[PDB]
């Protein structure tokens, strides 16, 4: 896994590679790691695929029931529900989740939940095995209030490098854009991002 989420002027964008491995065997080369828990609250999953799929399904259930009673939940609320599951079941889980969402009041927000189940609100976040190789690049190149096109380029270039060096990461680069305008899916193929 190479996953990241980046806030920008108009909202937030999530990015991910598409490789799922069992040892050195690529069990799925076209995986979708960008997961919808609410209309404009998505997450990036890393760690055990069973665990993170189970957690995301429970969160989606919790936020669907929240919405029926109290209306649209905040991104902070979604992050809290993720945290509760990750913290209270820390002994039995291997999950690293980045939560990203768009409110109209709060705009774009990013929360990262590492292994222990702690929560950290950040302007942008990186996670997965491939993230280690782009801490330097991302820290040097991230700016606040970037445009949509700049943020797409930042994520494309960042995950390109993560894929290049991490054997566990690869395939296509998937992205999901969260703004007031709606939800847009993007995909970028190897022939595009390898020549960057």
């Amino acid at each position: 896994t190479s996953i990241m989420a980046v806030t920008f002027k108009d909202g937030v964008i999530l990015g991910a590679d598409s490789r799922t491995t069992t040892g050195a065997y690529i069990a799925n080369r076209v995986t979708d790691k960008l997961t919808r828990v609410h209309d404009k609250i998505w997450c990036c999953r890393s760690g055990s695929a069973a665990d993170t799929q189970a957690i995301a399904d429970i969160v989606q259930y919790h936020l669907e029931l929240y919405t029926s009673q109290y209306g649209t939940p905040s991104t902070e609320t979604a992050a809290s529900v993720f945290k509760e599951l990750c913290y209270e079941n820390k002994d039995n889980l291997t999950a690293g989740i980045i939560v990203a969402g768009y409110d109209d009041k709060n705009k774009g927000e990013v929360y990262t939940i590492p292994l222990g189940g702690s929560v950290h609100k950040l302007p942008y976040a990186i996670a997965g095995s491939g993230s280690t190789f782009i801490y330097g690049y991302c820290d040097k190149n991230f700016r606040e209030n970037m445009s949509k096109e700049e943020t797409v380029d930042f994520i494309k270039h960042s995950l390109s490098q993560a894929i290049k060096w991490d054997g566990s990461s690869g395939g296509v680069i998937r992205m999901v854009v969260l703004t007031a305008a709606g939800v847009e899916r993007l995909i970028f193929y190897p022939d595009e991002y390898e020549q960057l």
């Binding site: 913290y87 820390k90 590492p114 292994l115 222990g116 702690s118 929560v119 950290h120």
Partner: protein, 233 residues
């Protein structure tokens, strides 16, 4: 039983004539990776107490929520919640110490070392320690982790016993604390340059200082150091 994942390093503290001082850096480490650079590890409770926490950050955030809930609960059906029946440093510590010992007794600890610093109703200085094992102790100076090995020796040169406390001003105490934080930055591989410092005084109340930096560092002498023995160039 677990293992700590995201962790915070030393918390250091000492008593002075009119109150107490406590400090801790703003880093959340992920093993050797210095992952999170804006983590507040000093958490004030009211205007008379500051709780400093080291160790597991997920457990720290849990304890932070317990303290927030404690303030809410104390205010319930309590007309003197901001006066005679406000939370004391001693009440906050005993509660935490109870929780820490209970959790270790179920073999599921909160993986932390905690120092509660504050001033009591009668003006008395409060400074006590508790950790994942439920072990507690008090001293004129207290420190966790690396701080225990490097900060305490320096802080004990200012206040060596109880009778040194009235002779120690807030200026002398803060100076000592700030120097100790510099020494820890020189020598602890899991420390950062950025830290927070809190003073609780019986006269001037709670002063919370954020975004402090280690300054006046000596590095110039490094230019003359060459090789590991015989090398001259």
């Amino acid at each position: 039983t677990q293992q700590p994942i995201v962790t915070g390093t030393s918390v250091i503290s000492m008593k002075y004539d009119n109150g107490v001082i406590i400090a801790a850096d703003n880093l959340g480490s992920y093993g050797s990776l210095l992952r999170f650079n804006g983590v507040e590890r000093l958490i004030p409770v009211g205007d008379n107490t500051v709780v400093g926490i080291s160790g597991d950050i997920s457990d720290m955030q849990h304890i932070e929520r317990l303290l927030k809930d404690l303030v809410t609960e104390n205010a319930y059906d309590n007309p003197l919640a901001d006066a005679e029946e406000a939370l004391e440093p001693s009440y906050i510590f005993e509660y935490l110490a109870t929780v820490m010992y209970q959790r270790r007794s179920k073999m599921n600890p909160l993986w932390n070392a905690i120092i509660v610093a504050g001033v009591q109703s009668n003006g008395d200085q409060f400074l006590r320690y508790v950790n994942l094992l439920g072990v507690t102790y008090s001293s004129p100076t207290l420190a966790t982790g690396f701080g225990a090995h490097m900060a305490n020796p320096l802080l004990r040169k200012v206040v060596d016993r109880e009778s040194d406390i009235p002779k120690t001003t807030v200026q002398v105490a803060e100076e000592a604390i700030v120097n100790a934080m510099r020494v820890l930055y020189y020598r602890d591989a899991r420390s950062s340059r950025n830290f927070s410092l809190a003073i609780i005084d019986k006269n001037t109340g709670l002063t919370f200082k954020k975004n402090l930096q280690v300054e006046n560092m000596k590095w110039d002498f490094a230019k003359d150091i060459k090789g590991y023995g015989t090398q001259k160039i």
